Design an enzyme around this catalytic site. Structure first.
Site, PDB file in Angstrom:
ATOM      1  N   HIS D 293      39.075 -82.225  33.708  1.00 35.10           N
ATOM      2  CA  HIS D 293      40.330 -82.182  34.450  1.00 35.10           C
ATOM      3  C   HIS D 293      41.522 -81.681  33.643  1.00 35.10           C
ATOM      4  O   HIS D 293      42.632 -81.651  34.182  1.00 35.10           O
ATOM      5  CB  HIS D 293      40.654 -83.564  35.036  1.00 35.10           C
ATOM      6  CG  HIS D 293      39.510 -84.181  35.773  1.00 35.10           C
ATOM      7  ND1 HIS D 293      38.703 -85.151  35.220  1.00 35.10           N
ATOM      8  CD2 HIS D 293      39.020 -83.947  37.013  1.00 35.10           C
ATOM      9  CE1 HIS D 293      37.773 -85.497  36.091  1.00 35.10           C
ATOM     10  NE2 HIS D 293      37.944 -84.781  37.189  1.00 35.10           N
TER      11      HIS D 293
HETATM   12  O1  LIG Z   1      34.561 -83.730  36.737  1.00 36.26           O
HETATM   13  C1  LIG Z   1      33.741 -83.859  37.641  1.00 36.26           C
HETATM   14  C2  LIG Z   1      34.142 -84.412  38.931  1.00 36.26           C
HETATM   15  O2  LIG Z   1      35.430 -84.725  39.038  1.00 36.26           O
HETATM   16  C3  LIG Z   1      33.281 -84.598  39.963  1.00 36.26           C
HETATM   17  C4  LIG Z   1      33.635 -85.387  41.184  1.00 36.26           C
HETATM   18  C5  LIG Z   1      33.713 -84.535  42.453  1.00 36.26           C
HETATM   19  C6  LIG Z   1      34.186 -85.370  43.638  1.00 36.26           C
HETATM   20  C7  LIG Z   1      33.250 -86.557  43.875  1.00 36.26           C
HETATM   21  C8  LIG Z   1      33.620 -87.366  45.102  1.00 36.26           C
HETATM   22  C9  LIG Z   1      34.930 -87.773  45.320  1.00 36.26           C
HETATM   23  C10 LIG Z   1      35.272 -88.516  46.438  1.00 36.26           C
HETATM   24  C11 LIG Z   1      34.291 -88.853  47.342  1.00 36.26           C
HETATM   25 CL1  LIG Z   1      34.714 -89.791  48.749  1.00 36.26          CL
HETATM   26  C12 LIG Z   1      32.984 -88.466  47.156  1.00 36.26           C
HETATM   27  C13 LIG Z   1      32.656 -87.723  46.036  1.00 36.26           C
HETATM   28  C14 LIG Z   1      33.185 -87.407  42.607  1.00 36.26           C
HETATM   29  C15 LIG Z   1      32.701 -86.573  41.425  1.00 36.26           C
HETATM   30  C16 LIG Z   1      31.938 -84.003  39.889  1.00 36.26           C
HETATM   31  O3  LIG Z   1      31.232 -83.925  40.889  1.00 36.26           O
HETATM   32  C17 LIG Z   1      31.462 -83.518  38.579  1.00 36.26           C
HETATM   33  C18 LIG Z   1      30.137 -83.117  38.424  1.00 36.26           C
HETATM   34  C19 LIG Z   1      29.683 -82.689  37.187  1.00 36.26           C
HETATM   35  C20 LIG Z   1      30.537 -82.653  36.105  1.00 36.26           C
HETATM   36  C21 LIG Z   1      31.858 -83.042  36.244  1.00 36.26           C
HETATM   37  C22 LIG Z   1      32.332 -83.474  37.481  1.00 36.26           C
HETATM   38  S1  FES Z   2      40.459 -84.927  31.785  1.00 39.28           S
HETATM   39 FE1  FES Z   2      39.273 -85.976  33.319  1.00 39.28          FE
HETATM   40  S2  FES Z   2      37.484 -86.672  32.235  1.00 39.28           S
HETATM   41 FE2  FES Z   2      38.726 -85.722  30.684  1.00 39.28          FE
END
Ligand SMILES: O=C1C(O)=C([C@H]2CC[C@H](c3ccc(Cl)cc3)CC2)C(=O)c2ccccc21
Ligand code: FES
Ligand SMILES: CCCCCCCCCCCCCCCCCC(=O)OC[C@H](COP(=O)([O-])OCC(O)COP(=O)([O-])OC[C@@H](COC(=O)CCCCCCCCCCCCCCCCC)OC(=O)CCCCCCCCCCCCCCCCC)OC(=O)CCCCCCCCCCCCCCCCC
Ligand SMILES: CCCCCCCCCCCCCCCCCC(=O)OC[C@H](COP(=O)([O-])OCC(O)COP(=O)([O-])OC[C@@H](COC(=O)CCCCCCCCCCCCCCCCC)OC(=O)CCCCCCCCCCCCCCCCC)OC(=O)CCCCCCCCCCCCCCCCC
Ligand SMILES: CCCCCCCCCCCCCCCCCC(=O)OC[C@H](COP(=O)([O-])OCC(O)COP(=O)([O-])OC[C@@H](COC(=O)CCCCCCCCCCCCCCCCC)OC(=O)CCCCCCCCCCCCCCCCC)OC(=O)CCCCCCCCCCCCCCCCC
Ligand SMILES: CCCCCCCCCCCCCCCCCC(=O)OC[C@H](COP(=O)([O-])OCC(O)COP(=O)([O-])OC[C@@H](COC(=O)CCCCCCCCCCCCCCCCC)OC(=O)CCCCCCCCCCCCCCCCC)OC(=O)CCCCCCCCCCCCCCCCC
Ligand SMILES: CCCCCCCCCCCCCCCCCC(=O)OC[C@H](COP(=O)([O-])OCC[N+](C)(C)C)OC(=O)CCCCCCCCCCCCCCCCC
Ligand SMILES: CCCCCCCCCCCCCCCCCC(=O)OC[C@H](COP(=O)([O-])OCC[N+](C)(C)C)OC(=O)CCCCCCCCCCCCCCCCC
Ligand code: HEM
Ligand code: HEM
Lengths: 360, 40, 192, 328, 366, 74
Positions: D293
């Site tokens: 992020h």
């Molecule tokens: O940094 C992230 C990230 O932020 C998400 C997130 C995306 C949104 C998901 C989510 C959010 C809200 C709901 Cl209601 C359902 C799923 C949670 C995981 C990923 O899916 C991810 C996968 C692999 C590596 C890094 C990441």
């Molecule tokens: S800035 Fe979100 S996990 Fe590092």
């Protein structure tokens, strides 16, 4: 149970002017049934061990007759599940279906939550880099409460125990889905569907001959398109990075969730406080829930016509859709100040246009 | 209303409106005001 | 005695409210405070000329054209899933009722075909208020029932007679009272 | 109902006009009303006293009726094998029964001296009653025998205690045992999802620092997480110390000297405090940058920009030697 | 009752009922009220009569000179409709509010049709009289007659006779009336027939009321109320509004036909009745003669003429009776009997003898 | 009379206040159910708390069960 079959799917009488936009429920149900078939036949050869899950999925593709077909149908039909659900939701935001189909709308929301959970659990089972680090992120996101996260994980970090219980949960949830679908349809047929015109009319016509054939036609189109994408790979729906084995001490250099999760991801990129992040999801879902009793929020008598045709003012649902698409766009890109700035603009639009639906 | 069986959606209405007021108060405190007091 | 004391609180407050009652019509206090009335009054010449004026004119143009394409009136947009309007429709006379039925039929068919009407069929005013005398009566009739019957949270027998017991009067309209029979041919409430 | 009958012709079982399994002697009345009289003129076996099982009257019907291989039950009455077109004529002189088919398809009801309409009237099924009927057929007056105890000897009468306390105490006792057991079950089931007894997360490690070079970052493994050890340059130190003047502005203020007890050595837990990703080399402040992020950290570990709420966490550590460190 | 102001609760808790709780402040020295009738009249024509006996509950009643003997071929059934619409919506009250208020005050109220009168009345504590006078007068001052109330009230027009099929005595009464005055005045039926449900529209009801419900055809009577308060609250009711204007109606003399009629049904007795006309009715001078003779014969005792000379001398009669019904300008007088159905021809002979010798009386019986 | 009709009309002016009173009554009847369920919540979540907090919340009555294992080491 045959008499019920006839009462609800043969002699049931609809309005004459139900066009294709009212066929997408049937479609999501069909993608459910189909996804269940392919699920079960994938379970017969999958291995739920962190040491060897990945190679277990590769064995299906490489050494099993028609092995590749079931994996790819299962992978691609998920996208259609979500696409059909979003069309199905937007139709009823457009029409203000929730004015009188109160409990149906509530049931809908519960089904969408179930589907999100099911998909995300599935997404971890192939056990690649993206799977491991996605699980890490989402489990850290629900941290506010002590010990809940090591408990749900099973362990101090994502582990084979986590895989085992994710596999069992992903097995179970769809069928709970099915039960809630029956509940959904009960509330629906208690009331009766709305028109695109939003009037009450006596020019009704029975289901079996006229509307059943339209259902069948759209079903043909959908089966077509699923097979097209599944066999030839026209679009890069899923990122390549789940093709790499897991490493617990190194992240992938570029990160892109599955498309149906990108908007959420965008939010997590742009809001500073992590709790603010989570609260945005909670608040937006609560706002959608609140639409179930919109008749009470005002003393003017309500109508379903939103007069959006030819209207220079457009409508809040259309602005919502375009804001959401913009958020998907920004989701996809790298973290940079300008993307974050337009992110925050789009986020404010997305939140405000949801709040404002109650203000008639 | 008298002669009606819907009794649990009104409660959910009030709870939801409550909860949104809550969430917005806390969000204003968390994301805006506390930093602002570092810029004031 | 806790309950009688809180009774006393409630009773004194109600007596205050009672003592201030007028004996005749008195105009309502304004809906907006004096600050906002001042601000609006100040900004009127720009706001009404540039923004509110055209918005309120465009709106009526859009509404009128959509109603004329289909040959509906405005009061054809209200449903009978609304109790007040259901009563109003019960109180209608034959001719108005028949014409409403016909217009709704034609509108359904035209929206199915998606064909405009000829412009010489569109020469009428759609915004006549033909339902008003009946809506006001319906409101009166349904207000008095709340006053004279709905003033308390009444207590009932649960899950008996096909109704949950918390207030419903039509059988099997809620999930926990679905599926009233396991054998036989069923039946309908309207034929009891 | 869902149940058929089985009226059919059969070659193992002759029809009842041919071979009745019941005792085929019946009395006949001119009018069923007359059956009243006999009930107030006959004797009855149940009006008279007996004391031993050997005195009980003996059945009229014979034990020797049904035969065949593997037939346990040797006595039956009624069967539904079908009648022929021309049935066997009952002999009324022997008091045989005449009913249904044998009235319709037989001359049995014929009498020379009497009109036919009068004659047929005597062959309804109410006009026949078996021999022994008035003498043996019971007609109870109550379900209770006077030789058994009813409520009269168990009723709690005047003078008795109240038993509501006891009854409700009994059932409350049952329920509180029940609830304890239920809570135990749920507690065990919850506990079963908790981490296993092999993990324990215990341990400590040591690191030799001779091979490291200036400007380099080394990475090590500790209690399941990564740990960074960096040999900072003089300019890295200066970058960290220049931002001490802007500590006002930071989200998690701290001075560099605390984070580097030895100034040239920087040590941190290699994990993003936002949601757990691992920061990469670089970012805007010559420190680290998280790709998930977009959080940035400086050359001392401090969070300068992005959604992460705190600086990189310091591990519990000690410098054992000029050139060796201990973790944990 | 939004809360309650008094918190003291049951102040006599635990005091037995054979132990008094009166203080000497609540004793009085008794003064009777005066109980001769008081007579008054409003300016519009309404006549008022009152009495007081110092009871705690009052009786209130409004009497209108609109019976069924005033209907015709176009009107038949209208009076029943009006009675079946009593305490329905009026100018300033709804039907629901009216009846619910009457219930919650604790009162009992109603309306009754006859062949010459229509009566409304109510009853509860005397301190509620000011709240009851409006609701009684409303019905004659300004009813609305909304169509959807007429339509909903229709089935009560038929049940009224459907219940008469298990009340043989009343049934015979109606047969006597319709046979005595065939097709005129007192002869008319007290109910709506099928032919009577056509003209069930507001205009006929309203046009009928405009001919009868004027004030000078009414009386208001009260018992156990203070007369000056009654006069005051009645005057305050008609002061704002225009009442139905007077009409110089005329009434035709009944024509007595007599005749004969039979109606068979599985009842286990032969019910029989014979009757003759009273010339002049209540306005005839001999109103006392018939009422004395009825008690010589035997009303609805055991030393009466019928009891001694019929019931004690025949085994097969269940009951014999003399009846006497009078109206403003005609009546009937006769005998009624229940007998074993195999001996009706003897029943007629007994009745004929009895009628034979009513002409003569002895002073002991008199 | 106008006066009496006015009184009858006004009898129900305070509908909302009566409804608030109804809220009060039903909640007074309902709310004690919180005690059973509260005890059970605490029952389940007690063994999750730190040993010190278990000792404190029971005013020192609760102590680690003695099952004859894991004793001190000289
Ligand atoms: O940094 C992230 C990230 O932020 C998400 C997130 C995306 C949104 C998901 C989510 C959010 C809200 C709901 Cl209601 C359902 C799923 C949670 C995981 C990923 O899916 C991810 C996968 C692999 C590596 C890094 C990441
Ligand atoms: S800035 Fe979100 S996990 Fe590092
Ligand atoms: C990450 C950040 C974001 C986080 C998310 C933020 C989200 C915010 C937005 C929230 C959106 C809305 C949420 C729901 C609100 C509901 C409000 C409400 O009460 O509406 C009243 C409203 C009717 O009110 P009314 O009009 O006044 O009528 C009066 C009647 O008397 C009323 O009687 P009736 O018969 O007419 O109505 C049916 C009745 C009776 O209904 C039934 O009997 C149906 C029973 C079906 C059971 C099938 C199995 C379901 C298992 C749970 C699955 C959960 C999945 C969750 C998704 C995520 C998964 C990870 O049900 C109800 O009345 C509703 C009861 C409450 C429902 C709560 C649902 C959500 C929570 C459920 C799970 C709880 C957690 C523990 C278990 C988790 C296990 C996975 O009812 C509805 O509209 C309900 C529609 C159906 C939806 C729910 C379906 C599931 C039912 C579960 C029941 C509880 C048992 C659970 C299992 C326990 C054992 C394992
Ligand atoms: C499957 C079910 C099992 C079968 C048996 C049925 C089970 C139900 C028993 C529980 C009900 C106890 C309360 C009795 C109330 C009696 C009142 C009365 O006279 O009746 C007339 C009255 C309606 O007459 P009305 O006033 O003319 O109607 C106008 C409207 O009510 C509109 O009125 P308004 O707009 O003027 O506003 C009025 C409102 C004004 O007040 C408000 O609106 C306050 C709003 C503040 C927000 C805070 C939330 C308020 C709700 C509290 C919920 C807490 C309970 C849960 C505690 C969990 C403990 C673990 O008044 C109230 O809210 C007062 C009543 C609130 C009581 C609700 C909670 C009662 C539960 C107590 C036991 C809890 C143990 C549960 C254990 C765990 C399992 C669930 O009845 C009600 O209002 C019903 C209230 C109770 C809710 C319905 C019961 C649920 C039935 C469906 C089953 C769903 C189960 C789903 C699971 C499925 C599994 C697969
Ligand atoms: C290469 C080597 C080759 C070697 C070849 C060797 C071949 C040897 C063959 C031997 C064949 C023996 C059977 C001859 C049958 C003749 C039939 C005849 O003439 O019918 C004329 C004639 C037929 O006319 P009908 O009109 O049918 O009249 C008869 C009635 O229908 C009858 O009905 P009813 O109403 O008049 O009577 C009442 C009825 C109904 O009675 C009841 O229902 C009463 C039931 C009471 C039961 C109580 C049990 C309580 C105790 C339970 C204890 C727990 C046990 C379980 C747990 C234990 C642990 C596991 O009674 C019965 O049903 C009697 C059933 C008798 C069953 C005897 C079975 C013998 C099996 C011998 C072995 C065969 C091979 C086995 C399979 C091999 C592999 C495939 O029948 C008669 O006159 C009656 C004759 C009855 C004779 C029965 C006694 C036979 C004794 C044979 C002795 C053989 C000794 C062999 C020694 C071998 C040494 C090497
Ligand atoms: C005697 C004569 C005979 C009479 C016979 C009469 C008939 C009745 C019987 C009576 C006789 C005795 C019978 C024995 C019964 C008891 C045994 C029993 O029940 O054991 C059960 C037993 C349970 O054993 P367990 O769970 O291992 O027990 C462990 C203990 O609980 C240990 O667990 P723990 O220590 O972890 O427990 C924790 C506990 C710990 O408890 C304590 O330590 C409490 C100490 C109590 C002290 C006692 C005080 C009273 C005495 C004082 C003396 C007064 C003196 C004055 C009088 C004398 C002088 C005048 O703490 C709590 O619970 C929470 C604390 C309180 C919560 C409330 C919050 C209050 C906050 C405080 C606020 C104040 C401020 C504090 C803050 C500090 C700062 C200021 O059953 C089993 O083991 C399981 C059996 C397997 C069956 C499974 C069930 C079926 C499942 C299948 C279901 C699947 C199928 C599908 C469903 C089927 C549906 C049909
Ligand atoms: C809805 C889900 C509930 C799950 C239950 C688990 C709860 C936690 C563990 C138990 C806690 C203690 C019990 C609750 C307290 C008692 C309830 C109460 O208030 O009492 C009401 C009443 C108590 O009645 P009472 O007569 O004793 O007292 C009430 C009267 N006064 C107040 C005057 C004293 O209980 C009943 O009447 C229940 C009737 C049934 C009794 C027998 C049940 C035994 C089990 C039968 C077979 C089980 C298999 C079926 C299950 C399916 C799955 C396998
Ligand atoms: C509406 C309520 C619905 C409740 C549904 C909840 C069901 C599932 C409960 C799971 C609890 C898991 C807790 C996570 C922490 C880890 C647990 C664990 O095993 O820890 C190790 C501990 C033992 O520790 P240890 O010895 O392994 O070492 C760690 C030491 N401590 C714990 C001090 C850190 O095991 C347990 O004690 C088992 C956990 C029991 C807790 C049970 C909690 C039940 C929750 C229900 C309460 C509901 C109240 C109502 C709320 C509603 C509000 C609207
Ligand atoms: C609505 C219903 C379902 C949805 C939306 C869904 C969704 C998904 C998704 C998105 C994946 C990821 C596949 C990939 O990344 O290649 C997946 C995998 C999987 N699903 Fe589901 N699923 C559903 C039902 C089921 C059911 C009912 C079962 C079994 C009973 C099942 C078993 C599996 C298995 C074994 C995998 C692993 C695939 C692999 O390892 O290649 N699914 N599912
Ligand atoms: C698995 C998920 C779902 C399934 C299987 C499903 C199924 C259906 C079906 C078959 C219909 C009737 C025909 C049609 O409209 O196509 C329907 C109608 C409807 N659904 Fe869904 N649905 C799902 C999700 C949702 C969601 C997420 C919502 C709302 C957020 C929702 C709200 C509605 C509404 C409001 C209607 C009726 C609209 C109207 O009558 O005007 N449903 N659904």
């Amino acid at each position: 149970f045959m008499s019920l079959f006839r009462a609800h799917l043969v002699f049931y009488r609809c309005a004459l002017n139900l066009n294709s936009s009212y066929n997408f429920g049937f479609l999501v149900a069909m993608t459910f049934v189909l996804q269940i078939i392919t699920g079960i036949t994938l379970a017969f050869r999958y291995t739920s061990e962190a040491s060897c899950a990945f190679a277990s999925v590769q064995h299906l593709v490489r050494e099993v007759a028609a092995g590749w077909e079931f994996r790819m149908l299962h992978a691609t039909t998920a996208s259609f599940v979500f696409l059909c659900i979003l069309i199905h939701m937007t139709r009823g935001l457009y029409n203000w279906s929730y004015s009188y189909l109160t409990t149906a709308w509530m049931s809908g929301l519960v089904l969408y939550l179930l589907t999100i959970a099911t998909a995300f659990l599935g997404y971890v089972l192939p056990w690649g880099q993206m799977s491991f680090w996605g699980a890490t992120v989402i489990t850290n996101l629900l941290s506010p409460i002590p010990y809940l996260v090591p408990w749900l994980l099973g362990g101090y970090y994502v582990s084979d125990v986590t895989l085992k219980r994710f596999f069992v949960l992903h097995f179970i949830l769809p069928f709970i889905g099915c039960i809630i679908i029956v509940l959904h349809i009960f509330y629906l047929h208690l009331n009766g569907s709305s028109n695109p015109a939003g009037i009450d009319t006596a020019l009704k016509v029975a289901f079996y001959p006229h509307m059943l054939m339209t259902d069948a036609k759209c079903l043909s189109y959908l089966i077509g398109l699923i097979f097209l994408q599944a066999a030839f790979g026209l679009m890069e729906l899923s990122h390549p990075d789940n093709s790499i084995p897991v490493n617990r001490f190194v992240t992938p250099l570029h990160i892109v969730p599955e498309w149906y999760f990108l908007a959420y991801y965008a939010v997590l990129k742009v809001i500073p406080s992590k709790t603010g992040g989570l609260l945005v999801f909670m608040s937006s879902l609560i706002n959608l829930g609140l639409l179930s009793e919109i008749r009470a929020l005002n003393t003017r008598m309500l109508i379903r016509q939103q007069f959006m045709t030819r209207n220079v003012v457009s409508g809040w649902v259309i602005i919502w859709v375009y804001s959401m698409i913009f958020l998907i766009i920004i989701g996809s890109a790298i973290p940079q100040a300008t993307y974050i700035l337009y992110g925050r603009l789009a986020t404010i639009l997305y939140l405000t246009t949801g709040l404002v639906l109650c203000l008639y | 209303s008298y002669g009606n069986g819907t009794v649990l959606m009104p409660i959910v209405r009030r709870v939801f409106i409550g909860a949104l007021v809550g969430i917005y108060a806390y969000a204003a405190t968390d994301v805006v005001l506390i930093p602002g007091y570092a810029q004031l | 005695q806790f309950h009688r004391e809180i009774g006393k609180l409630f009773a004194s407050y109600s007596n205050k409210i009672t003592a201030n009652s007028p004996v005749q019509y008195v105009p309502s206090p304004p809906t907006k405070g004096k600050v906002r009335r001042a601000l609006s009054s100040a900004l009127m010449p720009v706001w009404f000329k540039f923004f509110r004026g055209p918005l309120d004119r465009w709106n009526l143009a859009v509404m009128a054209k959509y109603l004329r394409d289909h040959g509906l009136m405005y009061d054809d947009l209200y449903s009978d899933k609304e109790p007040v309007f259901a009563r109003a429709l019960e109180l209608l006379p034959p001719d108005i009722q028949a014409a409403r039925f016909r217009r709704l039929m034609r509108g359904t068919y035209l929206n199915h075909l998606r064909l405009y009407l000829p412009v010489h069929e569109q020469n009428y005013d759609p915004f006549i208020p033909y339902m008003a005398p009946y809506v006001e009566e319906a409101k009166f009739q349904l207000q008095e029932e709340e006053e004279l019957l709905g003033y308390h949270m009444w207590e009932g027998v649960w899950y008996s007679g096909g109704v949950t017991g918390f207030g419903d009067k039509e059988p099997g309209e809620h999930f926990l009272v679905a599926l009233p029979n396991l054998y036989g041919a069923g039946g309908s409430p309207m034929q009891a | 109902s869902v149940h058929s009958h089985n009226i059919r012709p059969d070659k193992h079982e002759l029809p009842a006009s041919e071979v009745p399994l019941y005792y085929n002697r019946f009395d006949q009345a001119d009018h069923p009303s007359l059956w009243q009289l006999e009930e107030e003129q006959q004797r009855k076996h149940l009006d008279q006293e007996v004391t031993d099982v050997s005195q009980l009257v003996e059945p009229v019907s014979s034990p020797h009726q049904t035969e065949g291989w593997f037939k346990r039950l040797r006595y039956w009455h009624y069967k539904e094998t079908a009648e022929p077109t021309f049935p066997r004529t009952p002999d009324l002189s022997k008091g045989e029964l005449a009913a249904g088919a044998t009235v319709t398809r037989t001359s049995v009801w014929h009498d020379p001296n009497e009109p036919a309409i009068v004659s047929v009237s005597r062959f309804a099924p109410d006009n026949f009653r078996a021999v022994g009927f008035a003498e043996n057929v019971p007609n109870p007056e109550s379900t209770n025998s006077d030789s058994h105890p009813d409520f009269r000897e168990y009723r709690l009468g005047p003078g008795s205690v109240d038993r509501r306390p006891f009854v409700y105490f009994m059932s409350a006792s049952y329920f509180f045992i029940t609830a304890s057991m239920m809570r135990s079950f749920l507690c065990k089931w919850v506990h079963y999802w908790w981490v296993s007894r092999d993990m324990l997360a215990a341990g400590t490690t040591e690191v030799d620092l001779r091979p490291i070079q200036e400007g380099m970052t080394a990475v090590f493994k500790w209690r399941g997480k990564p740990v960074f050890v960096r040999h900072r340059t003089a300019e890295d130190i200066a970058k960290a110390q220049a931002d001490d003047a802007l500590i006002g502005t930071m989200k998690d203020p701290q001075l560099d000297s605390e984070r580097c007890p030895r100034p040239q050595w920087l040590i941190n837990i290699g994990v993003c405090t936002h949601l757990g990703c691992i920061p990469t080399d670089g970012g805007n402040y010559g420190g680290w940058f998280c790709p998930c992020h977009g959080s940035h950290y400086d050359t001392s570990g401090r969070i300068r920009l992005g959604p992460a709420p705190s600086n990189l966490e310091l591990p519990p550590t000690v410098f054992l030697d000029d050139h060796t460190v201990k973790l944990g | 009752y939004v809360g309650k102001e008094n918190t003291k609760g049951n102040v006599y808790e635990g005091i037995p009922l054979d132990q008094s709780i009166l203080e000497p402040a609540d004793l009085r020295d008794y003064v009777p009220p005066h109980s001769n009738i008081q007579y008054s009249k409003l300016d519009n024509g309404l006549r008022i009569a009152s009495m007081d006996r110092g009871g705690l509950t009052a009786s209130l009643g409004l009497f209108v000179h609109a019976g069924t003997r005033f209907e015709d071929v176009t009107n038949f059934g209208v009076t029943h409709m009006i009675q079946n619409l009593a305490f329905a919506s009026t100018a300033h009250l709804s039907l629901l509010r009216t009846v619910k208020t009457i219930e919650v005050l604790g009162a009992n109220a109603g309306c009754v049709v006859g062949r010459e009168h229509l009566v409304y009345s109510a009853e509860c504590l005397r301190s509620h009289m000011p709240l009851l006078v409006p609701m009684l007068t409303g019905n004659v001052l300004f009813p609305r007659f909304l169509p959807w109330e007429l339509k909903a009230c229709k089935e009560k027009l038929i049940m009224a006779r459907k219940r008469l099929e298990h009340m043989p005595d009343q049934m015979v009464s109606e047969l006597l009336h319709t046979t005595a005055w065939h097709n005129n005045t007192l002869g008319h039926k007290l109910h709506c027939t099928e032919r009577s449900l056509g003209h069930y529209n507001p205009d006929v009801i309203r046009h009928y009321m405009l001919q009868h419900f004027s004030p000078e055809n009414m009386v208001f009577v009260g018992v156990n109320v203070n007369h000056d308060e009654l006069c005051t609250w009645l005057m305050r009711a008609f002061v704002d509004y225009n009442a139905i204007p007077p009409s110089k109606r005329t009434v035709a003399s009944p024509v007595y036909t007599g005749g004969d009629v039979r109606l068979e049904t599985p009842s286990p007795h032969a019910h029989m009745a014979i009757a003759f006309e009273t010339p002049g009715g209540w306005n005839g001078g001999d109103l006392v003669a018939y009422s004395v003779l009825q008690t010589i014969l035997g009303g609805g005792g055991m030393y009466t003429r019928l009891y001694l000379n019929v019931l004690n001398q025949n085994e097969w009669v269940e009951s014999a009776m003399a009846f006497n019904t009078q109206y403003t300008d005609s009546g009937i007088f006769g005998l009624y009997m229940l007998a074993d159905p195999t001996k009706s021809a003897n029943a007629v002979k007994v009745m004929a003898e009895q009628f034979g010798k009513m002409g003569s009386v002895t002073k002991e019986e008199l | 009379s106008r006066a009496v009709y006015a009184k009858l009309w006004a009898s129900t002016a305070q509908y909302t206040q009566r409804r608030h009173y109804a809220w009060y009554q039903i909640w007074s009847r309902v709310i004690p159910w919180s005690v059973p369920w509260g005890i059970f919540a605490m029952w389940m979540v007690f063994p999750a708390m730190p040993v010190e907090y278990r000792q404190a919340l029971t005013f020192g009555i609760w102590q680690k069960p003695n099952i004859g294992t894991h004793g001190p080491d000289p």
